[PDB]
Write a protein that binds this ligand. Structure first.
Ligand SMILES: [Co+2]
Ligand SMILES: [Co+2]
Ligand SMILES: [Co+2]
Ligand SMILES: [Co+2]
Ligand SMILES: [Hg+2]
Ligand SMILES: [Hg+2]
Ligand SMILES: [Hg+2]
Ligand SMILES: [Hg+2]
Lengths: 177, 170, 174, 177
């Protein structure tokens, strides 16, 4: 099934971050994203795999990161993830069987069921790890998304875009974040 | 645990990893954990009241409390045992119905004041020896959540976090 | 151990000891410094046990000064890279001998401070050549309560562990 | 080989940092470096080994760090690192055989190839680790640069600047960051 993925939907907190919410007096003040995940996001888009974001918490900081990544499909501040999954797939033009999801907590359980393939980050709780198809070995916010994107691209015969200097230079124009 | 109706949590080293992020004006950022926030909401949904106890008051901590809908708290005081009793009275519960989670010496009187106590995984030996249950998770990395899952499970409500259908109700 | 019981002054490095060594920059320099709450309590415990505490940092910033004010630290030498003389100047301000002073560090800059002090501690993530030069290597990483591990050790050595290890023991100094 | 190093080029994110990009609503807001790396950088320069920074991103935060460190050689904003390497070498007046590089991701693969010696931080992926000469034991942003500088200096018989009080003091006038 990894070979047929055309869409990846990722949760944000605890997946693209280590779960920390850095607050100031006004709310989230800083969100910390991982550079290697950003590169994995860019590699998937470059392999014509779309990437969408689902997050129960909306912030202009998350929105900036999304814009920096060139992500156009996403639902922020929405608690019902199963429905958003189906709405995003329709917007992406793909089926659930062509989509993979990566999450870290209970809110993601319906998202795992709606998607054809699911991943849990390494520090997700056991009831989330037990629900997915693959448990990653990397903690959320430490490159788990990248671990998954490398996995998918490898399954699609595209490991050369990240595992040799040459494949890399041939996509570099689209690798920015 | 089945009879816990109120949970009081220290903030620094429990809801955070103990780091105090300063600028020239004092704390500038406080880092919480997303999975603990969900655990807090699960408890409240399960009619278990939640309070925060902290000897550091800051508008940052108050913004986090507001975002989580936490209704009870005592910010600014170093004498936690008294704060425990005053909070129990506000909550309408007895000590045997209240659990506390802490990480340091200042929490010792609070564990003793409460019926049940939890220590985070990186609490010092003397704090760990004083509690009923030592958590396996480090402060600021989901130790409150580890605690709340255990209380809800004990009360027969693990379905609110352990299955998709289970979760889909609330 | 013998020395620990006679400590009356503790001098601490800041980066890599009271912090995990990260320098959080914005375009103007350090923008945030991250300390540990359990260290703050170990510091107050030492002061309450009549053990003076000073900071010795080769970097000076309004952020670090704010942290020192909150902690109630009165003695500090900030902005001097050569720590050997600053250790001595600090002991003079404190009114203590090198033999009555302990230092906690993490890096080569601290080597002269360990030699100047009577007792020395290294954080768990200090490099081998720093761990090999101190009297006691801590098991806690810097920025994660390494100062507290040391203060609990000093207070324990002086028969004052009660101020941190029991509820009753504690309530007296709050 | 370590004995002949005269120039060290270092990637930034994931090497001098732990890889996190700390965002606010306007992009990166904080960059987090490590104090012992900064001392390693000064030790190198003091021991006649120049240091250069290479990053696919440019920011006034990174420039401030570079300025504080006394680093004069850098190439920022360039995503194609192999030619950046030769350009920095030419600025340094040193050859590739006398240059060492430290990186953490796919983008650095061409950089390892262009330098004479290469190092990967401990949390780099397998494909980056397999490509370098030496895999360090320290994670990026936690002193991996310092692990490398210490190794190079020790190889050159200059370990006394970091392993002795007397050696350090002889060079202190140059150890500020
Ligand atoms: Co999440
Ligand atoms: Co605490
Ligand atoms: Co230091
Ligand atoms: Co990098
Ligand atoms: Hg989905
Ligand atoms: Hg209590
Ligand atoms: Hg000293
Ligand atoms: Hg190079």
């Amino acid at each position: 099934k990894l070979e047929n993925i055309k869409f990846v939907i990722t949760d944000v907190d605890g997946v693209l971050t280590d779960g920390q919410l850095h607050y100031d007096a006004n709310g989230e003040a800083i969100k910390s994203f991982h550079v290697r995940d950003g590169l994995g996001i860019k590699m998937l888009m470059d392999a014509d795999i779309q990437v969408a974001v689902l997050s129960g918490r909306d912030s202009p900081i998350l929105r900036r990161r999304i814009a920096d990544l060139g992500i156009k499909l996403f639902f922020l501040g929405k608690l019902e993830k199963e429905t958003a999954c189906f709405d995003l797939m329709k917007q992406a033009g793909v089926t659930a069987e062509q989509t993979a999801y990566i999450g870290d907590d209970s809110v993601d359980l319906p998202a795992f069921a709606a998607c054809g393939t699911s991943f849990a980050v390494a520090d997700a709780p056991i009831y989330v790890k037990n629900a997915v198809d693959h448990v990653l070995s990397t903690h959320g916010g430490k490159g788990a998304f990248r671990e998954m994107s490398d996995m998918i691209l490898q399954a699609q015969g595209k490991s050369s875009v990240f595992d040799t200097a040459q494949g890399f230079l041939k996509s570099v124009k689209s690798m920015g974040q």
